């Protein structure tokens, strides 16, 4: 069954005669919803996907230079010029260099000097805008502990369809009213994805290119180092890969995954309202399971203090009510604690069918009691309704 | 001639009858040494090279992972084990994961989990120890303004040979006594070299390998990210290239060059002592240049306020003394200022030979006077001995 093994598991109880139940859905989390005379339901958020995202800005984190050229003038002959100064693909810088008789000038003193290089981007990171209108939440709704699908439903929630109705066979129907970023971008850097704040992403000190789309880079000087060697010559060297520095600057930032055109979100929470009104209990008109039950394995405690029990039923008596409870004294068999797998029913009309049960035992000593009469099975339990009523067989 | 065009140029004056002159030699710098009745000498530090350096430590700045494996145990079954835990090539991490009926365990709760990956270094930076005993300084010594080598000497200074003697032909000999790091390393990262402090280099948060040379890396965890995804699984991803982050962390650090086995230093200074004792003036026994001088181009001011003059001498009269000075009044021709190209002599016995002169003019108005009598050449000069004496020709 669902939720039993989950560490991040929530237990929500709906009021008697109530219609709505408030639920908060986390990634890798389960919510077990219980209600008086209603079946216990499991609600889990499977996936959160953002699709059709528009590119807002690209940043160069690894670059390469080529086609280097230089120009210089004599001390009073004005500023140095290169055709590459007008080319957007070229990164250029103007300085002053020592000129004189020894290097082709009639005068001594500082002369203008320009250096140019063709900038090429080797690797880039992209930032995409998250549209709240293109979000897709995939929720799983299950009847907690129904026999082995009819009793489970996969629903898709979107701003276009924030209201969904799930049919759970003989357990009726369940309604979901949910509320599916205003300052977040979707960052992609070499198959690694992140959710970053608009302000931080805008201030990145790397060569950039805004919008869609050879290309033309702005602030190419961020990955290109222009050095002045003792006022004798100007050198140009590319800085190298910044992905590691960007990674460290992304300390504590939210991660993400890919699906080709859709981006899977690994974090966030979804607030919902559950319409319990149409949920119904299965087997209110059934007879009680008369044959013997046997434990297929020893009962085990979950991470939340509850007890999971697997039983095999020897009977062939169609769909019947499973007698299951906990008692502190074996004489009067007064019910203690409660059943999470509320009002359990066997659906199989064939022998030795299996059933999974979940009980919420009281604190201290108690017994797990499955079945009725002499053929009933017991197991002592130590910690730290939902049970079908029946006549006295003892 | 040397030093005239150099911006970082020093002028040092030696006392009359003096033996030693203290000099500090910088990279891309010139020192013009002047002394009474001695030839003017140019001293320049050409190269500083450190050879035969022993490797002290290698740091991985870009890595790659492969051969990923995992192992897990059930809640009470103890710690997870992999053979890769004992392998030095493998980076491993132990954690706790949710275990239960749904994933192969009889009990629910946290179970031990280990994850391993084969670490491979793609790119590395090396740190080498600078031995003071393996330093080599190459110094250039020139006679400042001698005619067009005999009057120049290339000397090599090492801790093995910190004393050197340079022969300058007819200008005698010159002695050099110099003093050729205790907390510095030679860093190499993808053809780029640096001089870094021992303390900083030792604290680098990257996978390392000490000494010579499967290889075996320590602190592989610095480039490998082990993530825990909602206590359900452990992921392993390599961080990527750190060269950019290392580059930025090397803010203000000294740079360097290569020669295959030798490392060129672009910074530092060399303190020396010059033995002026054996230096002699050329042409004290020569006659005066009787023929006419002509300016080959207009005199030019250097970056240090001095004046450079190029003259052509029409005479065929062998080696003679060049009449050159500055005067404020053309009548008495009393010498003002001084000559940097002290006691100039023509060596060529062939006509129209060329000579370069350097004068230190007084402040304000003065005249450059080359030659004697009616055939002498003049040029007016405005700013902001070393002259051969001769009889009156005026």
């Amino acid at each position: 069954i669902r939720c039993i093994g989950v560490s991040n598991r929530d237990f929500v109880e709906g009021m008697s005669g109530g219609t709505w139940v408030d639920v908060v859905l986390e990634h890798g989390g389960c919510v077990t919803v219980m209600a008086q005379d209603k079946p216990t339901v499991d609600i889990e958020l499977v996936t959160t996907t953002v699709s059709n995202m528009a590119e807002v800005r690209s940043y160069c984190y690894e670059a390469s230079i080529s086609d280097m050229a230089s120009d210089s003038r004599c001390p009073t002959q004005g500023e140095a010029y290169l055709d590459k100064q007008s080319d957007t693909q070229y990164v250029c810088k103007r300085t002053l260099v020592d000129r004189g008789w020894g290097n082709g000038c009639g005068l001594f003193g500082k002369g203008s000097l320009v250096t140019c290089a063709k900038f090429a981007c080797s690797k880039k990171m992209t930032g995409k805008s998250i549209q709240p209108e293109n979000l897709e939440y995939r929720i799983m709704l299950s009847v907690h502990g129904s026999q082995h699908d009819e009793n489970r439903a996969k629903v898709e929630i979107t701003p276009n369809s924030p209201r969904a109705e799930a049919t759970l066979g003989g357990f009726g129907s369940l309604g979901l009213d949910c509320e599916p970023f205003s300052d977040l971008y979707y960052l992609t850097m070499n198959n690694k994805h992140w959710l970053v704040h608009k302000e931080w992403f805008h201030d990145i000190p790397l060569p950039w290119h805004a919008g869609a789309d050879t290309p033309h880079w702005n602030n190419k000087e961020a990955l290109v180092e222009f050095k002045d060697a003792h006022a004798k010559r100007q050198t140009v060297v590319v800085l190298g890969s910044q992905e590691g520095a960007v990674h460290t600057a992304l300390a504590g930032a939210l991660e993400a995954e890919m699906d080709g055109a859709k981006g899977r979100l690994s974090s966030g929470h979804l607030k919902c309202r559950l319409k319990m009104d149409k949920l119904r209990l299965k087997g209110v008109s059934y007879s009680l399971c008369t044959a013997a039950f046997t434990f297929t394995k020893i009962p085990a405690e979950t991470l939340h203090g509850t007890v999971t029990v697997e039983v095999q039923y020897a009977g062939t008596d169609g769909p019947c009510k499973v007698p299951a409870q906990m008692a502190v004294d074996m004489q009067t068999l007064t019910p203690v604690g409660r059943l999470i797998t509320a009002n359990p029913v066997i659906t199989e009309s064939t022998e030795n069918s299996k059933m999974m049960l979940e009980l919420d035992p009281p604190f201290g000593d108690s017994y797990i009691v499955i079945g009725v009469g002499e053929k009933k099975i017991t197991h002592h339990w130590h910690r730290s309704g939902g049970s079908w009523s029946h006549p006295q067989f003892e | 001639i040397r030093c005239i065009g150099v911006s970082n140029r020093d002028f040092v004056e030696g006392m009359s009858g003096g033996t030693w002159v203290d000099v500090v030699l910088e990279h891309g710098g010139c020192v013009t040494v002047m002394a009474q009745d001695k030839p003017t000498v140019d001293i320049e530090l050409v190269t500083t090279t450190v050879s035969n350096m022993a490797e002290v430590r290698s740091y991985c700045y870009e890595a790659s992972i492969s051969d990923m494996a995992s192992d897990s145990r059930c809640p009470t079954q103890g710690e997870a084990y992999l053979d890769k835990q004992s392998d030095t090539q493998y980076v491993c991490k132990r954690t706790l994961v949710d275990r239960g009926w749904g994933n192969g365990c009889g009990l629910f709760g946290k179970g031990s989990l280990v994850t391993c990956a084969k670490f491979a270094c793609s790119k590395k930076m090396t740190g080498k120890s600078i031995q003071p005993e393996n330093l080599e300084y190459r110094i250039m010594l020139s006679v400042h303004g001698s005619q067009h080598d005999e009057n120049r000497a290339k000397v090599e200074i090492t801790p093995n040979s910190p004393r050197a003697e340079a022969t300058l032909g007819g200008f005698g000999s010159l002695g050099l006594d110099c003093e050729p790091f205790s907390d510095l390393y030679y860093l190499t990262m993808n053809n780029k070299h640096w001089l870094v402090h021992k303390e900083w280099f030792h604290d680098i948060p990257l996978p390392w390998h000490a000494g010579a040379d499967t290889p075996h890396w320590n602190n592989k965890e610095a480039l490998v990210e082990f993530k825990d995804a909602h206590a359900k699984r452990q992921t392993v991803v390599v961080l990527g290239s750190q060269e950019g982050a290392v580059h930025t962390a090397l803010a203000g650090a000294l740079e360097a060059e290569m020669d295959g086995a030798k490392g060129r230093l672009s910074s530092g200074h060399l303190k020396c002592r010059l033995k002026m004792d054996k230096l002699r003036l050329k042409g004290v026994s020569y006659s005066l240049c009787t023929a006419a001088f002509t300016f080959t181009k207009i005199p030019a001011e250097t970056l240090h306020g001095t004046v450079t003059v190029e003259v052509q001498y029409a005479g065929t009269d062998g080696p003679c003394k060049v009449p050159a000075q500055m005067a404020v009044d053309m009548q008495t021709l009393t010498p003002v200022g001084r000559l940097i190209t002290a006691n100039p002599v023509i060596t060529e016995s062939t006509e129209n030979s060329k000579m370069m002169l350097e004068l230190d003019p007084p402040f304000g108005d003065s005249y450059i006077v080359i030659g004697v009598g009616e055939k002498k050449i003049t040029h007016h000069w405005h700013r902001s001995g070393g002259s051969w004496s001769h009889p009156q020709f005026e």
Partner: antibody, heavy 121, light 109 residues
Framework: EVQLVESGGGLVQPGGSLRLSCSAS????????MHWVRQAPGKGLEYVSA????????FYADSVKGRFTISRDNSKNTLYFEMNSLRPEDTAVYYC???????????????WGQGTTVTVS | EIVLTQSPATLSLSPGERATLSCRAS??????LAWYQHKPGQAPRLLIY???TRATGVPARFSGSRSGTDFTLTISTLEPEDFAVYYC??????????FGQGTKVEIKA
Amino acid sequence: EVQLVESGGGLVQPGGSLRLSCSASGFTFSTYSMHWVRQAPGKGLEYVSAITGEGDSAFYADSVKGRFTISRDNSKNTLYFEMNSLRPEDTAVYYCVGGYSNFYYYYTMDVWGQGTTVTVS
Amino acid sequence: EIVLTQSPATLSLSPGERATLSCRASQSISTFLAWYQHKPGQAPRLLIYDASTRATGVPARFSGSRSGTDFTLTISTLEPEDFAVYYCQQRYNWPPYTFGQGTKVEIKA
């Protein structure tokens, strides 16, 4: 003795490619700026290209700009001239010229190669 | 763009005679002018640099002179080996280090 021995010359088609080489000996190659000078039949000498000693900066005349590429390998002591999109106007004897330089492309004294002939028909 | 204009186009002389070759620069280039000798089947040979400095092994009969933007190469007494094409080359500031069109020094009929 200081020498420049060139090769790579030959007969080529219009729009074709060719690569010239110029091997150097008798001097430290990195201390010399290298230049390409050409002479078309019946014409004078033409300065077309230049490269600094370290090979970090290159110059091209408007006549060869875009089509021709100058390069050097200081470990191999060789100068190269990649010629693409060759026109009949490019038919000439090509000379590699070298001169000791301590400032970009400037030189006083020089050394010339024997010359190699490039023909475009 | 610096232009060098050589004159005359052809100089027809006998051995022993004086050859005076001219080169005018389109603008002031100080003394950054070189002279070359070019014989058939041979590469050009540098004769003079810095307008008046004779290169290594260049004989005394070759001399360079200058008056403003006007440059002169004089071959005082022509020897049989001096009949060739002569070029001037400007080396002012930055490339192109342009050449003159050339002067042919030919044997007189």
